[PDB]
A paper describes a structure:
As the foundation of this analysis, an atomic model of the Fab-antigen complex was required. Protein crystallization trials of Fab4B12 were successful and yielded a 1.9 Å structure, with the crystallographic parameters summarized in table S1. The asymmetric unit contained two molecules, one of which exhibited fully defined variable loop regions. Despite extensive efforts, it was not possible to obtain a crystal structure of the α1-antitrypsin–Fab4B12 complex; SAXS data were collected instead. One thousand randomized starting orientations for α1-antitrypsin and Fab4B12 were subjected to rigid-body energy optimization with reference to these constraints and the Mon60,90 subunit map and scored according to both the cross-correlation coefficient (CCC) with the density and their correspondence with the SAXS profile (middle). Backbone and side-chain flexibility was conferred on regions of the Fab likely to contribute to the interface (heavy chain: 27 to 33, 51 to 57, 71 to 76, and 94 to 102; light chain: 27 to 32, 49 to 54, 66 to 70, and 91 to 94) and α1-antitrypsin side chains within the boundaries of the epitope. The five models that maximized these metrics showed an unambiguous polarity (right). One model was selected that best represented this cluster by root mean square distance comparison with the others. This showed the heavy-light chain partition to be oriented off-center along helix A, with the variable-constant domain axis perpendicular to the long axis of the serpin [Fig. 4, A (right) and B (left)]. The cleft between the variable and constant domains of Fab4B12 aligned closely with a central “dimple” exhibited by the monomer density (denoted by an asterisk in the figure), and the complex corresponded well with the experimentally determined SAXS profile (right).
Numbering used by the authors:
A (entry chain H): 1 to 52, 52A, 53 to 82, 82A, 82B, 82C, 83 to 97, 101 to 214
B (entry chain L): 1 to 94, 96 to 213
The structure:
Amino acid sequence: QVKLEESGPELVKPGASVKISCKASGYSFIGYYMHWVKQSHVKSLEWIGRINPYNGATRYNQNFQDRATLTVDKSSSTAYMDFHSLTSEDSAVYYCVRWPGDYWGQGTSVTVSSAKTTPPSVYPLAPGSAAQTNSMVTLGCLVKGYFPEPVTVTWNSGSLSSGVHTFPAVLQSDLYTLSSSVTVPSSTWPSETVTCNVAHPASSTKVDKKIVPRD
Amino acid sequence: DIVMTQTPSSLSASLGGKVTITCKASQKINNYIAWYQLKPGKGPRQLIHYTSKLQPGIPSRFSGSGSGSDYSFSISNLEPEDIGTYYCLRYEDLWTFGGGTKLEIKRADAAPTVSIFPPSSEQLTSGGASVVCFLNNFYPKDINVKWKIDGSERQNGVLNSWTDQDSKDSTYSMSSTLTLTKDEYERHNSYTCEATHKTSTSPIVKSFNRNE
Ligand code: NA
């Protein structure tokens, strides 16, 4: 079973460099060419280049050739991508992928920013009025001022999945903010507990916020 | 590099329907083309390699064909989960991706369910005040939101965010958040979120009074 295991998320300051690794297992590493692919919302899928692990011969997308270097450690079945002089335009998910493009690493998220890692503040979103005696109730929680991405939001530890929308984060300053909504029957809340669970792995924070009625 | 011209860049079709994507290379690429599916939160998934060969586990409703520099890709019996972006790839050795085709599922129009939320007491204690408006489960994706503070339009401090198309009910949602200082939030009383959507010439209006 072919597996490509990439290194973890990277937070790099502008102008600095990053080196990503990709450990191959389940086949002859020195036999197949290793490719690298960039995925961003602004540039879709871009080929970075490839390397022949046997002799180290490389081919590059001309757009990356002056800053990217592909290498391999033959004895350890690992391929590397070294990217120099990064800017915010280089923030993306980077994949290693074996020729002929059928096996992909899980991807490495690279964020290029001067912002410091910061836990989120979590605020409840309860309606500013009493629910009608027989209605559907929309609740939520606001996740504000964290860095970097991502955060994960669940409701009642995954037991409330109906009517859940977690919106994409937007940059509020140097920090991210998002909200998540959930809709439940008025017979369920507030007689039962509705809690949003916010996880931010970059800062090792797990927050539970119980949604309570306002007044 | 060569050019891989993928067309069209956007698709909208009905469930059970059929779609087709064209990929035209700037020269002959000798059938070394592959087709990928990219869904949010997942890595690229190769559906077809060598023009027409399915990958293991891929259903036969995905198909590819072509030769020389003209290639095509089709999805029949469209399912709600087929939503995503599709790419051709020239993979022989020097790779070139097509520009991508974003696939939307067509469905009946749906007005948004609009909800407005006052700033929480916990946030006000910190000196901040975010007013949050949810506009959930609407179709089509085009929508406009207006904020009114004391009946006056407000444009500064508003952040908007739109979901991708829902893979289950094929609807869209969006959040609009007005962030103020606590001081500015307390010198006004009526906060209004207004949604204008194709489903009605009249906007959906939600608001609250700060003094409850
Ligand atoms: Na075909």
